[PDB]
């Protein structure tokens, strides 16, 4: 989204880095290695504004980056939002994401 929440296991304020890319492995329309650039297209560093509560990171991004699709939690410090060929990647250092969702006021 614009404002996305990441729940985590740290008692601190882990750094979060957001990336945007198209056609990553298994997101291609016509299956594996069917896209124009194997492995994914241009990776864009998403500018973020970070805010912290106990075990919660509030990630603010420009509106153009809003993408609600499938919220996929990867067993390490990574959450993905996948909408067909498009991916919004959230990478957390020094902690593990336990839950992720668009900020509901």
């Amino acid at each position: 989204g614009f404002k996305f929440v990441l729940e985590h296991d740290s008692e601190y304020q882990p750094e979060v880095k957001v990336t945007s890319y198209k056609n990553a492995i298994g997101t291609e329309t016509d299956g594996f290695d069917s896209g124009p650039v194997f492995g994914g297209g241009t990776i864009y560093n998403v500018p973020v504004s970070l805010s912290y509560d106990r075990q919660k990171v509030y990630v603010e991004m420009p509106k153009s980056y809003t993408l609600a699709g499938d919220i996929i939690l990867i067993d390490d410090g990574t959450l993905l939002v996948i909408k067909e060929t498009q991916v919004l990647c959230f990478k957390m250092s020094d902690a593990k994401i336990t839950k992720g969702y668009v900020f509901v006021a």
Binding site: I25, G26, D30, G31, F32, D33, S34
Partner: protein, 163 residues
């Protein structure tokens, strides 16, 4: 490991690659047809080591035991460990054993028989007397002491065999 094919246009490509990498990686720790630096494993085929081999635990080879009275009360107990036979002379001379005679009560079985004639040196309890028993390749042992009709024969050692 059993792996699935990876091809252009396939569905669940990432999951297939991951599962294939994990299947292969598992065999690098245990199982499969690979010999590991840990765990109990059975290995087949002629393994030739061209360097030095060190064994800190036990080294077990094929073992077989036999015991019998050769003749005249003399008992021979054998244990084959690889190409070596461990012997122990025992019993008590209970009848007349002629000098240079064949001990005809029991022969040494073929699996314990040497390629060449073996002279097993022994001693008689209570004095300075020695003797020897020859085990030829036939296993029909021969007594090479003098004519004897009493005493306690003893002696522990080894002799070579082959396979």
């Amino acid at each position: 490991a059993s792996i699935k094919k990876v091809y252009r246009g396939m569905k669940n490509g990432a999951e297939t690659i991951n599962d294939d990498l994990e299947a292969i990686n598992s065999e690098l720790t245990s199982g499969g047809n690979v010999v590991h630096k840990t765990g109990d494993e059975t290995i087949a085929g002629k393994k030739t080591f061209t360097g030095n081999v060190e064994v800190n635990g036990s080294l077990t080879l094929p073992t077989k035991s036999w015991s019998g009275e050769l003749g005249g009360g003399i008992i021979l107990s054998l244990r084959k460990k690889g190409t070596t036979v461990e012997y122990s002379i025992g019993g008590e001379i209970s009848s007349s054993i002629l000098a240079n005679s064949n001990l005809v009560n029991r022969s040494v079985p073929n699996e314990f028989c040497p390629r060449n004639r073996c002279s097993l040196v022994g001693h008689m309890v209570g004095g300075w007397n020695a003797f020897h028993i020859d085990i030829p390749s036939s296993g029909v042992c021969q007594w090479f002491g003098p004519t004897a009709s009493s005493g306690t024969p003893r002696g522990t050692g080894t002799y070579p065999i082959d396979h």
